[PDB]
Design a protein around this ligand. Structure first.
Ligand code: HEM
Length: 127
């Protein structure tokens, strides 16, 4: 059974969440300011990352399937210059995706709040 705060049903079901994350991911990698970070990413990793997006953003309490977010981006930040601007771009691509799909405002806002919760997990909480 799905958790109480699972957004899958309201998004139209798992297939619909999977399609929305596809559109979103396509936006990310088509972004000239993000594409360079994704050039090295092979297909197995891409698929794991999409599953992480699906479950982290829409899966609800206890549903997250994937690597720790801190560890996943630590090298990107230390060695390749990943920064808060890239996060802003990625958050905005999800917003655009949901808006373009016509997602109701309340549902869209819950999803965007969940995306925002990833920021301190990736960049730490502050010095
Ligand atoms: C809610 C936000 C995010 C989530 C849930 C997330 C999730 C993940 C996960 C779980 C991985 C590891 C995949 C694996 O190998 O199993 C990953 C890797 C990666 N992420 Fe994210 N991420 C987020 C934000 C971002 C942002 C803002 C960027 C912008 C650059 C980004 C770029 C990447 C890249 C380029 C990789 C592959 C790194 C490598 O080659 O190992 N992610 N992400």
């Amino acid at each position: 059974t799905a958790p109480a705060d699972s957004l899958y049903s309201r998004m139209g079901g798992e297939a619909a969440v999977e399609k929305a994350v596809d559109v979103f991911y396509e936006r990310i990698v088509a972004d000239p300011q993000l594409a360079p970070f994704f050039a090295n990413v092979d297909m197995k990793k891409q698929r794991r990352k999409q599953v992480a997006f699906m479950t982290y953003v829409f899966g609800g309490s206890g549903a997250y399937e994937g690597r720790d977010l801190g560890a996943s981006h630590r090298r990107l930040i230390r060695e390749q210059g990943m920064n808060h601007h890239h996060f802003d771009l990625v958050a905005a691509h999800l917003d655009s995706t949901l808006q373009e799909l016509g997602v109701a405002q309340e549902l869209k806002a819950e999803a965007m709040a969940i995306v925002a919760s990833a920021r301190p997990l990736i960049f730490g909480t502050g010095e």
